[PDB]
């Protein structure tokens, strides 16, 4: 497992996080593979997927419940657990309730990282960030961050927050390159913010052109195309990735991607795909 520093914390985290969207349901709870999913999560944690990405929204709360069971076989302090508050709950009292229920469902006293899941232009950022600071002061949150903030909003968040904003979790992969067009990745890299790439496999939906260049490079490393697209992200400074893998095979395969060394010319060729 590759490790990288989170923001300017002097703390390193696993550079591959464990995406949990769809585990125990999507927008609503799905109780139908609960034992299988708890066992999957335990096996991922045991393989080294100690950085876990979840949200109150996930499975209508049930994803955090399953994660809550799975983490009982491990020392809590060895795990890096990330949750998120949905844009409907960014008002102070709603945020603190969401935090509390997240903690209840995880059955733990704190989260390692807590994110604004999406910005809500109707709720002043300063209010939301100050409520999150209360969470930190109370020992309920170790670090705060944001998600789906463009460069301007990240700047605005940084100016309005007593606590450091350690990351911006955004969509970023071999095809989806809004963080490059926005100057967001450069901003993060110059200002000690970790960019966390969600949908880092683009849910496997890729054009023919990108598949063609991915295949060449994959075979040169005797890897899969998905391994190449993870290694490409991990090769960039300040970039961490959160693939979702509901199968052992993919958990194992994606872990291997942390020991691929792409050449300079392969990096340039891959950069040229979006
Ligand atoms: N707003 C936000 O902040 C936001 C939005 C979207 C996602 N996220 C987070 O980011 C995570 C990942 O994003 P995502 O789930 O949207 O997309 P993703 O990780 O790009 O792709 C997930 C899909 O790829 C498959 N997969 C994974 N590894 C594979 C491999 N080696 N070979 C073939 N297929 C593979 C999975 O299948 P199997 O499950 O069968 O392995 C799943 O269907 C989510 O779980 C969530 O934690 C956050």
Automatic annotation (TrEMBL):
UniProt cross-references to InterPro entries, sorted A to Z: AKR, Aldo/ket_reductase_CS, NAD(P)_OxRdtase_dom_sf, NADP_OxRdtase_dom
Active site: residue positions: 58
Binding site for substrate: 117
Domain NADP-dependent oxidoreductase: 16-273
Site residues (Lowers pKa of active site Tyr), renumbered to this chain: 84
Source superkingdom: Bacteria
Keyword Cytoplasm: no
Recorded GO MF terms: nucleotide binding; oxidoreductase activity
Protein name: Oxidoreductase, aldo/keto reductase family
